[PDB]
Amino acid sequence: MMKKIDVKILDPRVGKEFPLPTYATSGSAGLDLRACLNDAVELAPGDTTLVPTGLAIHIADPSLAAMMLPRSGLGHKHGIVLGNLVGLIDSDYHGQLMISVWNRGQDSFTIQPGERIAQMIFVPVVQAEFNLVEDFD
Amino acid sequence: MMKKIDVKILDPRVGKEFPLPTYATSGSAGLDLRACLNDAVELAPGDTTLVPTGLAIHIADPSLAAMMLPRSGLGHKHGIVLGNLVGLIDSDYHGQLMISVWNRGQDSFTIQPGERIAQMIFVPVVQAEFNLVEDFDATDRGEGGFGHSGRQ
Amino acid sequence: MMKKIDVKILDPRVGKEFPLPTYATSGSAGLDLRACLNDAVELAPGDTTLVPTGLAIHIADPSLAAMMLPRSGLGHKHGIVLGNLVGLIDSDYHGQLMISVWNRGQDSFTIQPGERIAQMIFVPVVQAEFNLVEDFRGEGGFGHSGRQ
Ligand SMILES: O=c1ccn([C@H]2C[C@H](O)[C@@H](COP(=O)(O)NP(=O)(O)OP(=O)(O)O)O2)c(=O)[nH]1
Ligand SMILES: O=c1ccn([C@H]2C[C@H](O)[C@@H](COP(=O)(O)NP(=O)(O)OP(=O)(O)O)O2)c(=O)[nH]1
Ligand SMILES: O=c1ccn([C@H]2C[C@H](O)[C@@H](COP(=O)(O)NP(=O)(O)OP(=O)(O)O)O2)c(=O)[nH]1
Ligand SMILES: [Mg+2]
Ligand SMILES: [Mg+2]
Ligand SMILES: [Mg+2]
Fold first, then answer.
1. Shortest CB distance from B26 goes to which of A82, A83, A92?
2. Which interval of the chain is the signal sequence (chain A)?
């Protein structure tokens, strides 16, 4: 079940020094996002930093959304997760994709340029319309 | 894809003191949930508090569920997120929707009545039927997990 | 709506000492997962431990994934959540299902053999192929719509 998604490269290192995001294995649900940075960033325990990806997507189909998630190795082994926990990307967002990286653990961690620091899945979504009732029975 | 969902305005402040939940933009995936409180609540760093939404929904369709999530601005800038991280709402749950608000950050934060403090999406769900096997049809990923594909 | 998932039992207690995961009601979205431990694990505030389930699943269909989540009661009342926040099980994984348990709260907590410590849903997923373009809410994000 494939879907074409338009993407605009904002930093010319993307697609060259920093490969475009890809699925690590053929049945992976998420694609890995890379940190678009000149220099490594040291995250002390408790600190948050906003990491640019250097690209923008336009999902455009209002029956689809994306969810940014931590990776399980970074999250479990190093406490490197997301500051907003889960990042919900709307179908009508055109801006640069940004990653809120938060050190939830006890050890300092150093994010390298180009590192695969989070992942992103695409999921069908349903828009609800409310039917106001006085009681459900 | 639009679906009509029954909702009971369990707390009549919702729709009167502050607006009913709606989709912030046309192409928004989630709808914002508001703090149904009589008094402001100051959350010190590390603290949690249980905030009512004033709403009960009945999805009723077992092929659908809802998920409650933090908002990205409150979460990234102020460390205001969920105490259970992600809230899962069953299709046959029709009690009040409650929000566990947790201050994961280093500065205190005051939740005001009516404030949009989290968001909710509706997603399709599949119910699994387990088939016991002796061997798997092996794959390239195999048993690999927890960072086996590397950092770079 | 329903999908057949291959499962292998790795610990003989699973299905004998305590049940295999089951949907509690016909309208339940998730299945509860039980800690398959020999000895209870003490978790100080801020600690993380990796908890086996005694089970391996193989979803096998690349338009489907599973998401592991905290339970709302354990999360809100005791701060017992997931160390990777949300656990994403891929269609081509067939290792042991493992739960990263993190004590995010201010009080110690002990993970007990057999305790229902997390839950898991299965959701459809779509794999994307990129189309490079020069030009395409607008660009508004991270709070732009306000809170009032
Ligand atoms: O909570 C979890 C998360 C993942 N897993 C396993 C199954 C999943 O398919 C595999 C990899 O998941 P992620 O891709 O989300 N994490 P990461 O990218 O760090 O690992 P990998 O390098 O193997 O892809 O780890 C668990 O058993 N429990
Ligand atoms: O953030 C939440 C999460 C759940 N809920 C409601 C809806 C859901 O259907 C119900 C049960 O969710 P969980 O299974 O996550 N909680 P728990 O397992 O602790 O309680 P139960 O024993 O009733 O399943 O609680 C909320 O109001 N807010
Ligand atoms: O991790 C994220 C989350 C969101 N975003 C962008 C895309 C999304 O469409 C937009 C808004 O997301 P939320 O609605 O979850 N956050 P918030 O409600 O604070 O911002 P807004 O007022 O713009 O809706 O922000 C990111 O770039 N990274
Ligand atoms: Mg991975
Ligand atoms: Mg928003
Ligand atoms: Mg439950």
1. A92
2. none
**Structure obtained using:** X-ray
Among the partner residues B60, B115, B133, nearest to C6 by beta-carbon distance: B133
**Which residue of A lies nearest to C68 if distances are taken between CA atoms?**
A72
Q: Chains near C, with 3+ CB pairs < 8 A?
A: A, B
CA separation for the pair A125, A66 (Å, rounded): 9
Round to whole Å and give the CA distance between B81 and B87.
11
* C-beta of residue C147 within 8 angstroms of C-beta of residue B70: no
Question: Which residue in chain B is spatially nearest to C6 when comparing CA positions?
Answer: B131
Name the resolution in angstroms.
Answer: 1.8
Interface test with B, best of A120, A130, A131 (most B CBs within 10 A): A130
CATH 3.40.390.10 fits A1-137, yes or no: no
Query: Which run of H or of E encompasses A34?
Result: strand A31-34
- Residue A111 has φ and ψ, to the nearest 5°, of -85, 125
Residue nearest to atom 14 of ligand 1 (CA): A71
Show me where the domains of chain A are located.
1-137
**Contact present, B105 and A104 (Cβ < 8 Å):** no
Q: Which residues contact B24 (CB under 8 A, 6 or more apart)?
A: B31, B32, C137, C145
Fold category of C1-148 in CATH: Deoxyuridine 5'-Triphosphate Nucleotidohydrolase; Chain A (2.70.40)
- CATH code linked to domain B1-152: 2.70.40.10
